[PDB]
Design a protein around this ligand. Structure first.
Ligand SMILES: Cc1cc2nc3c(=O)[nH]c(=O)nc-3n(C[C@H](O)[C@H](O)[C@H](O)COP(=O)(O)OP(=O)(O)OC[C@H]3O[C@@H](n4cnc5c(N)ncnc54)[C@H](O)[C@@H]3O)c2cc1C
Ligand SMILES: Cc1cc2nc3c(=O)[nH]c(=O)nc-3n(C[C@H](O)[C@H](O)[C@H](O)COP(=O)(O)OP(=O)(O)OC[C@H]3O[C@@H](n4cnc5c(N)ncnc54)[C@H](O)[C@@H]3O)c2cc1C
Lengths: 574, 574, 104, 52
């Protein structure tokens, strides 16, 4: 028996933990995954010296923990088996595939991460705020009051994540790109550093934030927090919440302990689901919310009819570029070079402080030192120069988020023939209109690896604005990228596999009124009709957004916690 | 100040820790890598529920922690850059490559793992003994005494690793393949389970062993061992040992703390190097053993002239097969099937104990239940059937090790189009003759990612016996595998990239006499001429071996610890 | 729909087709060898502006076909090589090999 | 395919691809020598590799 139970130990669950453990609630948290990031529980797996010296290997780590949500039955023809080998007569269900899935209306790139800390163990830590046009309303008919509320929440969320915009300010490549794009779009678009949930520890090491940053996930009471109460239970699959007869309250949480195999009911005053956009929905559907099975509008469900509808996923375009000769020569514009590299009298110099220098002294010193110490190397960029981290945020005249940067994803690893210092990644993210027909639903026959109802998508990018903007977004990427350099062969401009972006929203969406705003939770993230059930995550976000959603989801979870603290009393510490 | 300092926390360092910590020595261990599995320090990363339900994803984890030893300068022609992009005029040194490396005499697949627990955090746990023909001599001119010593050591090593041969006894696939091969080679070759360092926890869950199994790596004293003394220091690069003026003793170990950036000297009575076959050699050359730079036979090194010569790496052939129709039909040979799948008529039965059954009751029961529970599935093999784990060990008439199995490596993932239940992996491993001209050496100008001298290979598989056997081994895999099924398209029979097998030996090889046996350590693993310096690992093995070397290296380490215990004494527990 | 855009290249002395004095081709004739880069300046700037033009123009018709994304083709695959025995009025002043009658 | 079958490359540089998975019994090069009509005069980075 606990005051609060939280399902999931991702950054959103840890937001609820931080808020409620701190306020004196007896808290339990359950995760289906295990502790596997080091002694700092739920920390970023990239915060090892070895990964930061070998960042392209972290692509492999990510791939290793993204498990595909819905894989359609495979129809590739393998007709070169030996005549003796067992050969199929049909395209039957193999290897965890989902026969409910139409391969042409899927989010084939969608995937989940089952580890303590969730996806925050591997994420790229971009935490921008949404502008009004992307953002859900928290106050109606008062834009000033809605703005003040969002500013209060985002400020606190940025504090929990340790969001900053200064960690790359001494990068030559970052400044080279930023300054060039600022000049090219002067009077039209503003560029800045990507806001990043990160703290620089040295010139070569960044401590990337994660769930751990938000809440350290250590059991309490402990020496550091003698009056707090928290227990984390990894390797526990949360299967369903049990509704009372009245459908006014949750009476228990049904769990499966994966190590012992035992199933138990857990009681709490308050139940918080923060299992991700897909798995919150799965859990609720397994509990009798929404409708199980292939949707049937002829029999709409009794509870939360909008659950699993109006789902949104962003369009993503990607390419890489190879820096222009002009930009590379600009790096060493202030230098006077004498002699021939490798010879006695080879000399690279500049005049510190000269009013006719294009670059600050700190930049010129780093370039001079690289060029004098590494005379075998043809480029003026220092070897351990930090990555560029540039953005022009979403605006009405360019309604997509942009990142002009380098980081580790499940795709786009730098390959060896072109120097990594030349390579810049371009990721533009579109906003998707919420449409009723875009659905996540769950099979009533097929189950996943944890014997839970198999998720199935029925998704296409809506026609009209979403599609028009997606294609203009691609063109914008082609036009903007050319100011920096040409495309890298092998990473030409392309739309990425739908859902690979992992920015799914609207699966359990928020609004003021269940029927009028076609939604599942209110602005306190409380499930309509229920006193004591709350959802956290990108699943709550009901709008068309292009920017990265985690910071906004956290802000909503903070607001949710404000309601819980007002409406539930912590039990006595005994 | 310590009694013993160990460099490296892989399974071999952990052998020295288990032995010396357990005997009261004050031990410090340093690792360049970090604690990054879970709370069980240095434990196997595949021991999560999620990876045991999603084993093909563990391939990506392995890829993410194998950092290539020596990558030659890249010479791929990229001639489709935009004319505005910066374009190279030469094949200059990019992306950490090694300009010392001849690409045609490399072990391009050789890689290292820098994490606490080393490669034991990901390995596949096969731990066979070497027979006499593969094994170094520990007792000269007394084969019975030599056999008795090896039996004693291997038995203790098997207990440390928890090696067993029973964990896959109830697998249908294992027994299907084992039985067929046994019958096909009756009176010619014997087959058995691969000996595996692993403990079954449930019908679907195996606790794979690791460094953690050997020694839990917790700091001591602690509640469970109050009189023991042990400290593990992760993220510490050990750089060199300091020789005394007469080259009879080590005076200190120089380290680099990677977090603070500071360097320090650590003093011990005994110095143990267990950093792996490549990195032990690196550290020693950086300490003035052998010679830095490109080998020059005109100027032989003063100390340990055989260091880095006579290196061995195994030839590796690989394919996968798709089970024969005949073997699949035999799975259900004992079944009477009435009616049609999916109908209420459908019935699958067998007679328990019948003399005409080809298979035991346990097998028929699992097949029956699978066929009745999954009537849509066309195969008779149960879905959670454990993997096959079959071998016929190295013998004079087939001088290679064999594995006929399924497990996760950096290559060979099961894709989607063929059912995984049908697929068997074949890995045959050849023995390589030690030859002086096969070398691992270290650059005197190029450094690696940790500013240490860059490793460089000069390697070809020896003509003569090694090459003959390697091609005969390929043929043997083609002939044997055909008894089970034809090749799986996309995993056709091939030699793997040299060194991808990660069984490198002989870099700091053992023998009785430094000069006569061309070696670096004696049979106590003590460096010739030095009282207090010991090496552990596959680098000590001086013979041509085909079986997996780690159990043999562990056995050597145990023998080495016997010497240390006879010659050095713990300090007073303070 | 296929989109092929073709840029113009400034004639530069350093861009050459020459023949080996040792290596021969399949007909035992001196082996052709190129020493070629797209000239910096206008040629390169126009080539990148052309790429961008193709991206902008093509989008009016439809999105890229996966597997045929916008790219520069291998140099010379276009098979529009010129200037190897070039025409002008005056051998010396116009750096040329034939006159306007194509006479050497 | 008809086109491909009558476009003969003008100048192919000496190949430097690393083929390190030959059987140990197979004849294996020690250098990137002139093979299969390649042109050792040719700088691969200043070519018209598509010329035919
Ligand atoms: C390559 C990559 C790059 C990214 N970059 C960005 C970025 O730059 N910015 C940004 O905002 N976002 C980024 N993201 C997305 C981001 O990590 C997610 O939005 C975020 O982690 C969501 O947090 P959450 O706590 O709602 O869910 P998650 O982090 O998904 O955590 C949910 C958890 O609940 C668990 N769980 C699931 N089901 C059950 C169940 N039945 N029972 C018990 N536990 C369960 C999981 O094991 C998991 O730990 C990135 C992610 C990836 C993978
Ligand atoms: C995919 C895969 C499958 C394999 N399967 C098998 C198998 O089935 N059976 C088998 O016998 N073998 C297997 N191996 C090989 C086996 O893992 C190794 O033989 C064994 O781990 C070597 O033990 P070790 O302790 O000598 O070295 P390692 O495990 O390599 O550990 C050495 C350590 O020292 C560290 N270190 C390195 N340099 C320094 C330095 N300068 N300073 C401080 N610390 C340093 C490292 O970070 C590391 O942790 C496999 C390995 C892999 C990768």
């Amino acid at each position: 028996k606990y005051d609060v139970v939280i399902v999931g130990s991702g950054p959103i669950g840890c937001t609820y933990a931080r808020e409620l453990v701190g306020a004196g609630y007896k808290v339990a948290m359950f995760d289906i995954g295990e502790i596997d990031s080091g002694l700092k529980i739920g920390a970023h797996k990239k915060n090892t010296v070895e990964y930061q010296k070998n960042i392209d290997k972290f692509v492999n780590v990510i791939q290793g923990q993204l498990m595909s949500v819905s894989v359609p039955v495979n129809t590739l023809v393998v007709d070169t088996l030996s005549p003796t080998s067992w050969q199929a007569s049909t395209f039957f269900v193999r290897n965890g595939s989902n026969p409910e899935q139409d391969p042409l209306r899927n989010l084939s790139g969608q995937a989940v991460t089952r580890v303590v800390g969730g996806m925050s163990t591997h994420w790229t830590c971009a935490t921008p705020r949404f502008d009004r046009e992307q953002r859900p309303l928290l106050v109606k008919d008062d834009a000033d009051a809605d703005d003040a509320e969002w500013d209060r929440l985002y400020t606190k969320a940025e504090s929990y994540f340790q969001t900053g915009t200064d960690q790359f300010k001494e990068s030559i490549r970052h400044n080279l790109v930023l300054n060039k794009l600022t000049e090219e779009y002067k009077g039209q678009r503003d560029f800045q550093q990507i806001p990043l949930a990160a703290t620089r520890r040295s010139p070569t090491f960044v401590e990337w934030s994660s769930a751990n940053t938000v809440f350290d996930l250590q059991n309490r009471p402990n020496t550091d927090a003698p009056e707090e109460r928290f227990n984390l239970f990894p390797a526990v699959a949360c299967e369903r919440v049990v509704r009372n007869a009245l459908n006014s309250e949750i009476e228990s949480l049904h769990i499966h302990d994966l190590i012992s195999g035992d199933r138990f009911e857990i009681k709490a005053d308050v139940y918080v689901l923060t299992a991700g956009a897909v798995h919150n929905t799965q859990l609720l559907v397994n509990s009798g919310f929404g409708q199980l099975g292939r949707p049937n509008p002829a029999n709409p469900p009794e509870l939360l009819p909008s659950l699993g509808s109006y789902i949104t996923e962003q369009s993503l375009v990607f390419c890489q570029t190879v820096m222009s000769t002009e930009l590379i020569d600009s790096v060493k514009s202030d230098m006077t070079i004498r002699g021939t590299p490798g010879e006695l009298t080879y000399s690279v110099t500049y005049t510190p402080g000269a009013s006719t220098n294009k670059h600050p002294d700190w930049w010129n010193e780093k370039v001079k030192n690289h060029m004098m110490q590494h005379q075998e190397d043809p480029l003026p960029i220092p070897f351990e120069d930090p990555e560029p981290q540039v953005t022009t945020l979403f605006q009405p005249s360019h309604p997509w988020h942009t990142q002009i940067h380098r980081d580790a994803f499940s795709y786009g690893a730098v390959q060896q023939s072109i120097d990594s210092r030349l390579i810049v990644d371009w990721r533009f993210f579109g906003r998707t209109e919420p449409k009723e027909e875009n659905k996540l639903w769950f099979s009533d026959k097929i189950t996943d690896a944890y014997n839970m109802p198999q998720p199935t998508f029925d998704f296409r990018f809506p026609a009209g604005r979403t599609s028009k903007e997606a294609e203009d977004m691609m063109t914008d990427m082609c036009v903007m990228s050319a100011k920096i350099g040409g495309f890298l062969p092998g990473s030409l401009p392309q739309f990425m596999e739908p859902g690979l972006v992992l920015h799914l929203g609207g699966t359990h969406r928020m609004g003021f009124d269940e029927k009028e705003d076609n939604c599942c939770v209110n602005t306190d993230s409380r499930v309509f009709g229920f006193k004591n059930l709350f959802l956290g995550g990108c699943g709550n976000i009901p709008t068309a957004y292009g920017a990265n959603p985690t910071l906004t989801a956290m802000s909503l979870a903070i607001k949710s916690c404000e309601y819980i603290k007002q409406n539930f009393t912590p039990s006595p510490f005994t």
